[PDB]
Amino acid sequence: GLVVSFYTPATDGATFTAIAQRCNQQFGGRFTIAQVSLPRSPNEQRLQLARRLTGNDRTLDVMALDVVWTAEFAEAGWALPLSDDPAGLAENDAVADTLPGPLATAGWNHKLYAAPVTTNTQLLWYRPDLVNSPPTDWNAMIAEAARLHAAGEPSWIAVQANQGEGLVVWFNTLLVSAGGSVLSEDGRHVTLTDTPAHRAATVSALQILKSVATTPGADPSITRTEEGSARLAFEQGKAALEVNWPFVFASMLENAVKGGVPFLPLNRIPQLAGSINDIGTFTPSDEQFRIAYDASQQVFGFAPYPAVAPGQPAKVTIGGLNLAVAKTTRHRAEAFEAVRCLRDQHNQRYVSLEGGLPAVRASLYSDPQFQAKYPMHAIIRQQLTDAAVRPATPVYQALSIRLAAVLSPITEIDPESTADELAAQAQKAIDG
Numbered sequence: 001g002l003v004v005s006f007y008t009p010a011t012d013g014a015t016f017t018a019i020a021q022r023c024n025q026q027f028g029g030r031f032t033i034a035q036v037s038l039p040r041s042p043n044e045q046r047l048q049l050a051r052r053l054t055g056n057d058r059t060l061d062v063m064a065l066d067v068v069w070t071a072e073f074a075e076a077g078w079a080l081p082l083s084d085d086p087a088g089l090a091e092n093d094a095v096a097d098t099l100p101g102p103l104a105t106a107g108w109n110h111k112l113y114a115a116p117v118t119t120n121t122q123l124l125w126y127r128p129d130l131v132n133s134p135p136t137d138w139n140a141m142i143a144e145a146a147r148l149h150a151a152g153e154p155s156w157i158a159v160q161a162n163q164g165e166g167l168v169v170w171f172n173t174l175l176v177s178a179g180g181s182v183l184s185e186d187g188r189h190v191t192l193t194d195t196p197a198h199r200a201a202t203v204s205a206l207q208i209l210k211s212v213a214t215t216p217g218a219d220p221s222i223t224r225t226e227e228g229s230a231r232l233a234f235e236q237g238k239a240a241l242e243v244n245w246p247f248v249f250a251s252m253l254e255n256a257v258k259g260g261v262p263f264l265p266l267n268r269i270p271q272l273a274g275s276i277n278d279i280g281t282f283t284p285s286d287e288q289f290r291i292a293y294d295a296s297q298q299v300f301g302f303a304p305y306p307a308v309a310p311g312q313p314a315k316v317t318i319g320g321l322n323l324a325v326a327k328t329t330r331h332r333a334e335a336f337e338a339v340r341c342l343r344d345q346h347n348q349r350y351v352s353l354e355g356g357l358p359a360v361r362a363s364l365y366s367d368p369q370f371q372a373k374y375p376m377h378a379i380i381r382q383q384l385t386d387a388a389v390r391p392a393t394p395v396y397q398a399l400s401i402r403l404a405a406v407l408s409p410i411t412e413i414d415p416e417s418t419a420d421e422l423a424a425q426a427q428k429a430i431d432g
């Protein structure tokens with residue numbers, strides 16, 4: 001039988017295998033999809049795909065790409081344009097019922113080179129028992145953290161700032177929210193400091209990074225650039241404010257039921273007995289979920305990502321995965337058909353409700369079962385509709401590495417001179 005390979009991160013290998021097996025039911029034996037797990041590390045994911053692509057591995061068909069790899073894989077000829085679908089359906093399928101944010105990540109040089117399947121956006125997570133109203137902007141985040149420190153309360157702001165992609169993501173969110181951009185749309189010009197308005201945006205972003213780093217009672221993983229997880233800092237009660245991807249929601253509930261969250265003893269609720277399955281995963285009934293969520297709202301809440309400007313909502317950097325057809329495929333028709341099935345409405349419902357991965361289909365955000373399991377659905381939907389996008393460029397890897405090297409450690413940022421250093425390093429990346 002004909003086999004179509006489907007390379008995805010091992011991180012969610014169970015989920016991506018499940019939707020491929022569901023898809024295999026509807027092909028009538030014409031072909032089958034074989035999911036193949038890439039390493040959990042995204043850096044190693046890209047490297048293995050690159051070796052198979054440059055090595056002309058003719059068994060490589062469909063691949064899930066991080067949303068920042070589009071420009072490189074398209075420019076290299078590694079990802080076929082969706083217009084190469086012999087059935088002529090890939091382009092219309094990728095656009096129909098897909099949220100604008102995810103779609104913007106799948107295009108390069110005015111053509112689609114991938115079909116979004118999963119997405120991601122950061123929210124504010126906070127302790128409502130310690131913080132009365134969630135901060136609406138970064139100035140309020142800083143004031144609240146300082147007030148908590150003066151009161152002897154958890155004062156850290158839990159946010160990923162180590163030298164890496166997460167720090168570039170945070171900077172990009174602040175930059176675009178302030179009205180700036182790393183590169184021009186075509187990715188050919190550096191726009192960090194080329195106009196007064198653009199420079200002001202860059203300086204504003206650097207000021208927020210530096211202010212967070214020097215707030216009283218800040219996270220020492222920031223102020224000393226030690227190791228430390230933002231998720232664990234909040235679950236362990238050391239931070240009352242956190243910005244992070246929505247996977248922390250399920251993590252909070254699961255670990256609280258397992259006794260790992262000292263301020264949220266969900267393990268003490270008798271109605272939650274048996275909600276942990278035989279591999280340690282929280283698998284509640286709908287009633288158990290309602291009980292767990294209601295109890296959690298006393299000490300655990302969510303809110304929109306803090307704005308940069310008081311009256312303008314944040315532009316939050318989008319993440320996720322896009323499905324691409326590799327140039328190495330011997331079966332384009334079936335590869336593009338697999339992509340459509342893997343992202344259809346039922347499989348989008350599956351990856352969200354069963355896999356905890358936010359969907360890209362707009363219709364799902366009106367679905368009642370989705371809304372019950374994602375009570376922050378409205379905030380996610382809004383931030384996916386008006387998202388910030390990291391710079392699209394074939395040299396994104398070098399660009400990100402150089403930006404992170406300048407930004408880190410954020411305690412050493414001097415906004416005015418760091419802005420010029422950022423622009424110079426970005427120019428070097430674009431030049432090669």
Ligand SMILES: OC[C@H]1O[C@H](O[C@H]2O[C@H](CO)[C@@H](O)[C@H](O)[C@H]2O)[C@H](O)[C@@H](O)[C@@H]1O
Nearest residue numbers: 011042066067120165166245247319320
């Ligand atoms: O939220 C779970 C995912 O987190 C990572 O991906 C996000 O963070 C990256 C930056 O470190 C972004 O490049 C990416 O676009 C985001 O989706 C992790 O790499 C994923 O495997 C997780 O599913």
